[PDB]
Paper text:
Lipin/Pah phosphatidic acid phosphatases (PAPs) are Mg2+-dependent enzymes that catalyze the dephosphorylation of phosphatidic acid (PA) to produce diacylglycerol. pmcLipin/Pah phosphatidic acid phosphatases (PAPs) are magnesium-dependent enzymes that are evolutionarily conserved from yeast to humans. They catalyze the penultimate step of triacylglycerol synthesis, through the conversion of phosphatidic acid (PA) to diacylglycerol (DAG). Structurally, all lipin/Pah PAPs contain highly conserved N-Lip and C-Lip regions that combine to form two domains: an immunoglobulin-like (Ig-like) domain and a HAD-like catalytic domain. The remainder of the C-Lip adopts a Rossmann-fold, forming the haloacid dehalogenase-like (HAD-like) domain and harbors a conserved catalytic motif DxDxT, where the first Asp coordinates a Mg2+ ion that increases its nucleophilicity, and the second Asp participates in acid/base catalysis.
Structure 1 was determined using a Δhelix-His construct that lacked the N-terminal helix but included a C-terminal His-tag. The Δhelix-His structure represented an inactive state due to covalent modification of Cys276 by cacodylate, which was present in the crystallization solution. Cacodylate modification of Cys276, which lies below the nucleophilic Asp of the DxDxT motif, induced a major rearrangement of active site loops and residues, including an Asn residue (N268) that binds Mg2+, the adjacent Arg residue (R269) we implicate in PA recognition below, and an Asp residue (D272) that is mutated to His or Asn in rhabdomyolysis, which formed a hydrogen bond with a Mg2+ bound water in other active states of catalysis. In sharp contrast, in the Δhelix-His structure (Structure 1), cap region 2 formed an upward facing alpha helix that was continuous with the prior helix and would be perpendicular to the membrane interface. This unique conformation was formed through crystal contacts, with the continuous alpha helix packing into the active site of an adjacent molecule. We thus consider this conformation of cap region 2 to be an artifact of crystallization and represent a catalytically incompetent state. However, it does highlight the flexibility of cap region 2, which may be important for the regulation of lipin/Pah PAP activity.
Residue numbers in the entry: 20 to 153, 168 to 268, 273 to 331
The structure:
């Protein structure tokens, strides 16, 4: 029944090509009389994108048809670099709209967020439930704000059912703590919550493995030479194996006590923020860009 777009992440590669994570979109309130007559068009930052379209399976999952060498059509959740370049994305947040039309009248519109990162961007992962929520932990909005001000990008992770996705986005946007708000960033969704025929290879993972796979997939959109995930906040093997050093894995408990793994330091969001230059050292070029957009 979901209508919407799971936030999309696109990364520019050192050779100028673009790669993205999967496009997960649904038109849950559209009655589809015949899926083969559906075509989906794309508008980015209020500009229609020419010569790009998506198709829809009988089950409602949407994909990019792309010819392989055999002139066979492959059904792709991840569009080609050539297609992504037609979007004319800017660094950071971009508005994206998908419009499902048929041979008949009536067009279904959904709106999402698509983020563009350069390959040298440094990401800071945060769980939502239990890490942002306890009710919201104290001092988290000031810390995350100052992480973002030092040039890092907050990336949120959720494993709630798709039903709650737009609510989780509203929750994060509504936090305010002493004037501080949560930095805008993408919310990635555990893949077991958005299974279709297009990503069903997923189903041969055990339930415990989905976060780790998600973080490896996030890393894979970056080039082999870089290490993009700088730190992670949770409530650990998943961060470690996706390239987070153990000192940068922050695990909060019941009591709002934060354990800095591998230092076995017991700390807080307030105290991490006090030592922000030591733990999240300023990234000069990346910080300048954030400052001059905000």
């Amino acid at each position: 029944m979901f209508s919407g777009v799971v936030d999309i992440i696109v990364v520019r590669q050192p050779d100028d090509s673009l790669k993205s994570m999967p496009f997960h979109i649904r038109f849950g309130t559209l009655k589809v009389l015949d899926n083969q007559n559906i075509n989906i068009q794309i508008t980015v930052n209020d500009k229609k994108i020419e010569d790009v379209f998506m198709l829809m399976l009988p089950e409602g999952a949407c994909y990019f048809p792309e010819l392989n060498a055999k002139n066979e059509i492959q059904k792709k959740l991840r569009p080609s670099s050539a297609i992504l370049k037609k979007f004319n994305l800017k660094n950071g947040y971009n508005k994206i709209q998908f419009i499902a039309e048929s041979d008949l009248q009536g067009k279904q519109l959904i709106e999402g967020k698509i983020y563009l990162y350069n390959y040298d961007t440094k990401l800071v992962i945060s769980d939502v439930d239990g890490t942002v929520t306890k009710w919201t932990h104290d001092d988290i909005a000031e810390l995350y704000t100052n992480i973002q001000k030092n040039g890092y990008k907050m990336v949120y992770l959720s494993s709630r059912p798709l039903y709650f996705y737009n609510y989780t986005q509203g929750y994060l946007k509504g936090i305010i703590q002493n004037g501080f708000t949560m930095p805008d960033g993408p919310i990635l969704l555990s893949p077991d919550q958005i299974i279709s025929s297009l990503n069903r290879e997923v189903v041969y993972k055990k339930a415990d493995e989905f976060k780790g796979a998600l973080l490896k997939d996030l890393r894979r959109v970056f080039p082999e030479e870089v290490n993009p995930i700088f730190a992670g906040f949770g409530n650990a093997t998943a961060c470690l194996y996706a390239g987070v050093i153990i000192d940068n894995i922050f695990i909060i408990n019941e009591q709002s006590q934060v354990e800095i793994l591998g230092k076995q330091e017991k700390s807080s969001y307030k105290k991490i923020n006090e030592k922000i230059q030591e733990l999240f050292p300023r990234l000069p070029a990346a910080a300048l860009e954030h400052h001059h957009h905000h």
